[PDB]
C-alpha cells in the first residue's frame, strides 16, 4: 500500500459519507487530484477499513481503482486513491437515464469485464460486485472499487445461488454478479427484481425465472446475461470469454 506523509494530502471538498467514515476529494503533492477516505470508530473498524487498502494495493490494472497510499501513522487514518469525477456507476446512470448509446454502455461493461478478468486471474474474488461499487471518470472508464469483501452484508439479488446456499464464492459467482451489473447498466441503474423480496428472488431463480431484457437492450447482450446466470456455475462463461464477446460486439457495432 505504501505510507504517505499527511503533509502531502490536501483535502478540498467532502463528496459524501461512507460506511466507516467520510469520503472526500482533494489533491496529493510530492500535484494530482485524488480521492480520500477518512475514518472517524473503534479498532473493530480500522483493521477492516485499512485491510481494504492492503488488498487493493496488490492490483495494478486500468479498470481497477489505483491506490496512491495510506495514512496510518497519523490521524485521521485514511486511504488515498485515484479521483473519479463521475463517482458511483449506479448513481451516474440514474442521473443520465437514456442519455447513452448502446455502444457506450457496452464500452463501460467491457472495461468492468477487463478489470474482473484481471482479478479472477489473480485468483481474487470480489464477492461484492455491483454498480454501486464501480466508479466512473470523465472519460467514462468504469473501475471496480470497494474491495472490503474481497478475498485472495452482501446483497442477495447480486449474489450467485451457490454463494448464498453453501457459501461457495469463486470467480464463477462474480460472473453471476457481473450479469446483474450488466442488467443495471442497460437499465440505467434500475433495481434488480424491483419490489420482489429477497426470498422471492431466491425462489424465483430456483424456479428458473431470470430478469427480462431491459428496454432497447440488444438480444445478444441479454443472452450474455442469461449465460452469466446459469444455475451450474461451471456452465457460466469465464470473464475471459465475456471480455472477448463484448469486443467482437464493439468491433462490429452492427451486431448490436
Amino acid at each position: 500500500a505504501k505510507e504517505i506523509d499527511a503533509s502531502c494530502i490536501k483535502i478540498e471538498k467532502v463528496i459524501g459519507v461512507g460506511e466507516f467514515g467520510e469520503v472526500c476529494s482533494g489533491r496529493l503533492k510530492v500535484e494530482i487530484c485524488v480521492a480520500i477516505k477518512t475514518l472517524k470508530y473503534t479498532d473493530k473498524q480500522r483493521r477492516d477499513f485499512l485491510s481494504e487498502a492492503s488488498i487493493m494495493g496488490q492490483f495494478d490494472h486500468p479498470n481497477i481503482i489505483h491506490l496512491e497510499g495510506v495514512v496510518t501513522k497519523c490521524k485521521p487514518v485514511m486511504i488515498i486513491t485515484e479521483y473519479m469525477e463521475n463517482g458511483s456507476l449506479d448513481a451516474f446512470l440514474r442521473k443520465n437515464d437514456g442519455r447513452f448509446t448502446v455502444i457506450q454502455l457496452v464500452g463501460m461493461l467491457r472495461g468492468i469485464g477487463s478489470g474482473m478478468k484481471y482479478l479472477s486471474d489473480m485468483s481474487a474474488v470480489h464477492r461484492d460486485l455491483a454498480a454501486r461499487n464501480i466508479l466512473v471518470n470523465s472519460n467514462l472508464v468504469c473501475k471496480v472499487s470497494d474491495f472490503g469483501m474481497s478475498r485472495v452484508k452482501i446483497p442477495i439479488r447480486w449474489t450467485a445461488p451457490e454463494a448464498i446456499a453453501y457459501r461457495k464464492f469463486t470467480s464463477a459467482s462474480d460472473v453471476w454478479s457481473y450479469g446483474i451489473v450488466m442488467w443495471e447498466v442497460m437499465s440505467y441503474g434500475e433495481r434488480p427484481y424491483w419490489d420482489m423480496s429477497n426470498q422471492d428472488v431466491i425462489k424465483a431463480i430456483e424456479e428458473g425465472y431470470r430478469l427480462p431484457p431491459p428496454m432497447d437492450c440488444p438480444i445478444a447482450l441479454h443472452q450474455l446475461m442469461l449465460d452469466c446466470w446459469q444455475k451450474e456455475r461451471s456452465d457460466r462463461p469465464k470473464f475471459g470469454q465475456i471480455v472477448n464477446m463484448l469486443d467482437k460486439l464493439i468491433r462490429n457495432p452492427n451486431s448490436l
Side-chain angles (χ1 to χ4, degrees), residues 1 3-9 11-12 14 16-21 23-26 28 30-43 45-74 76-94 96-150 154-166 168-250 252-256:
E3 188 76 22
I4 296 177
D5 206 284
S7 66
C8 298
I9 309 93
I11 309 173
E12 306 175 309
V14 183
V17 185
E19 179 177 52
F20 293 80
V23 181
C24 325
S25 53
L28 183 63
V30 190
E31 183 180 70
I32 56 171
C33 277
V34 293
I36 310 161
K37 300 174 66 180
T38 64
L39 179 64
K40 285 300 167 191
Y41 55 74
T42 314
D43 180 294
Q45 294 185 54
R46 175 169 182 163
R47 43 184 170 60
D48 302 308
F49 176 71
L50 299 178
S51 60
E52 189 235 306
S54 182
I55 301 169
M56 178 179 254
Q58 294 163 38
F59 309 122
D60 179 48
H61 186 290
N63 295 289
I64 295 187
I65 292 300
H66 178 71
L67 168 65
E68 281 302 317
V70 298
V71 180
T72 55
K73 304 177 185 176
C74 170
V77 192
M78 40 188 238
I79 309 179
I80 317 299
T81 60
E82 67 183 304
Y83 183 60
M84 302 294 266
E85 258 285 62
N86 300 306
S88 186
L89 177 68
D90 63 335
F92 179 59
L93 298 172
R94 297 156 183 165
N96 294 292
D97 200 312
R99 290 189 177 183
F100 292 124
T101 64
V102 186
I103 303 299
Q104 290 189 306
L105 293 175
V106 170
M108 308 177 126
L109 287 172
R110 160 61 175 61
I112 297 174
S114 178
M116 291 308 295
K117 186 205 186 313
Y118 179 70
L119 287 174
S120 59
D121 289 324
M122 303 274 282
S123 198
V125 188
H126 193 282
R127 310 170 63 253
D128 193 28
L129 189 58
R132 70 168 202 286
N133 288 328
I134 296 180
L135 309 171
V136 187
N137 68 20
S138 69
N139 299 182
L140 285 180
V141 174
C142 304
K143 317 197 181 200
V144 187
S145 57
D146 297 283
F147 291 104
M149 299 303 296
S150 285
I154 302 173
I156 286 179
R157 52 197 66 208
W158 269 274
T159 313
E162 70 272 18
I164 297 169
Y166 45 110
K168 180 54 170 176
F169 288 80
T170 70
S171 60
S173 47
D174 281 338
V175 170
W176 179 294
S177 288
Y178 183 77
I180 308 300
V181 163
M182 287 183 64
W183 196 86
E184 303 179 69
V185 179
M186 306 314 295
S187 70
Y188 285 101
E190 213 169 315
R191 180 98 190 300
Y193 306 105
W194 311 272
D195 51 285
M196 279 186 250
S197 71
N198 288 322
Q199 207 67 55
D200 295 326
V201 174
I202 297 173
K203 179 67 179 183
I205 286 301
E206 282 304 303
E207 288 177 36
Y209 171 79
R210 294 298 183 275
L211 285 168
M215 180 157 281
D216 307 316
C217 174
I219 301 173
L221 281 179
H222 179 246
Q223 188 54 53
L224 190 48
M225 291 172 209
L226 293 185
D227 301 324
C228 291
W229 298 324
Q230 267 171 293
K231 171 56 59 176
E232 172 53 50
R233 94 187 203 221
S234 83
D235 290 345
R236 307 173 190 163
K238 281 57 180 59
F239 275 116
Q241 301 178 298
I242 299 177
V243 175
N244 207 87
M245 293 180 206
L246 296 182
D247 275 300
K248 290 187 176 182
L249 292 170
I250 304 174
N252 308 69
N254 297 300
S255 63
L256 287 166

